[PDB]
């Protein structure tokens, strides 16, 4: 499934994403944009064996279990495969466990390069109606 | 599948360290997030703090700076320190995974005074 | 912080009958909502996850709901094993904090 870009504010609202930990929904819309474009089904194979899964590309190396990766770590104890659906559930559960370190959402690269420092208010402004 | 396990005083003199450890067997300390809670008598639970991938600590602005929550990689536990204690420190501390399912017995620290 | 308040105090119910703990916070805290349930001599267990998120090998009879700032505990029939106090805790913010709990005792 792809979201479009008001679908997805609210869907992440409904999950309690909005000014989670200091961190308003306008970030997490434009992290997934970079990340993943919307995608809930988006996966990338990593150089180094690991693979990202996700709307938000999830790292196999330290969060999920794919059994595709050497000596992986599964921090957020889930198979990989629960990250590829329609419903974010496991994947919002999974990001905020992320975000909860003290790096914040500088974990994920793409909002570190085209959110941070930006207008992010804007991926969510003109939305509901 | 995962056993944590407190150890620590029952009984200390205030104004001195309050030391607990945290051994974690079945799982792997590894690079997950580990907290501290505690009861006061007659109270309810209260959040000390927690230590997450990165090493970064989190705590609580109520213990005015005095905690301190470590790592130890090598024998596979986890610590709390906590300075100058007194009467209000007393409590059940429990050790437990970040994500809420696994906790430990709980140990009982009695600052007598 | 975040202040988490639980009502009632101590609920006080007969065996079988519904029971509804209600927990309300002084800011919006999306669903990141726990409820927690200590029995005597052990250690807090969580029950629910994230306001309505169920656990596998806890009873069915347990069910949370609500947003924003507004969450309830349902539990169906209240069993003996069901007498104990129960904790929301948000997530939303640091510091985490707990409500003042809602000890469940029999009537």
């Known amino acids: 499934k792809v979201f479009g870009r008001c679908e997805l504010a609210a869907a992440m609202k409904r999950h309690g994403l909005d000014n989670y930990r200091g961190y308003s929904l306008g970030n997490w819309v434009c992290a997934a944009k970079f990340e993943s474009n919307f995608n809930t089904q988006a996966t990338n194979r990593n150089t180094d064996g690991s693979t990202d899964y996700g709307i938000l590309q999830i790292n196999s190396r330290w969060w999920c279990n794919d059994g595709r990766t050497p000596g992986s770590r599964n921090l957020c104890n889930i198979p990989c495969s629960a990250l590829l659906s329609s419903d974010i559930t496991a994947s919002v559960n999974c990001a905020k466990k992320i975000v909860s370190d003290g790096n914040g959402m500088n974990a994920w690269v793409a909002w570190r390069n085209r959110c941070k420092g930006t207008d992010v208010q804007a991926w969510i402004r003109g939305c509901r109606l | 599948q995962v056993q944590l396990q407190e150890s620590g005083p029952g009984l200390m003199k205030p104004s001195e360290t309050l030391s607990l450890t945290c051994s974690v067997s079945?799982?792997?300390?590894?690079?997950?997030?580990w907290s501290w809670i505690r009861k006061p008598p007659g109270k309810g639970l209260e959040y000390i703090g927690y230590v997450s991938y990165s090493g970064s600590t989190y705590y609580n602005p109520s213990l005015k700076s005095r905690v301190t929550i470590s790592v130890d990689t090598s024998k596979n536990r986890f610590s709390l320190k906590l300075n100058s204690v007194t009467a209000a420190d007393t409590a059940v501390y429990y050790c437990?995974?970040?994500?809420?399912?696994?906790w430990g017995q709980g140990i009982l620290v009695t600052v007598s005074s | 912080e975040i202040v988490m308040t639980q009502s009632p105090a101590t609920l006080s119910v007969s065996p079988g009958e519904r029971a509804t703990l209600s927990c309300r916070a002084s800011?919006?805290?999306?669903?990141?909502l726990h409820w927690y349930q200590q029995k005597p001599g052990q250690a807090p267990r969580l029950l629910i996850y994230?306001?309505?998120q169920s656990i596998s090998g806890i009873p069915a009879r347990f069910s949370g709901s609500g947003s924003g700032t507004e969450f309830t505990l349902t539990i169906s029939s209240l069993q003996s094993e069901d007498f104990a106090v129960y904790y929301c805790q948000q997530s939303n913010s640091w510091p985490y904090t707990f409500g003042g709990g809602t000890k469940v005792e029999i009537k």
């Open positions: 800011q919006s805290i999306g669903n990141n």
């Open positions: 079945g799982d792997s300390i590894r690079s997950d997030y």
């Open positions: 437990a995974r970040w994500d809420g399912d696994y």
């Open positions: 994230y306001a309505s």
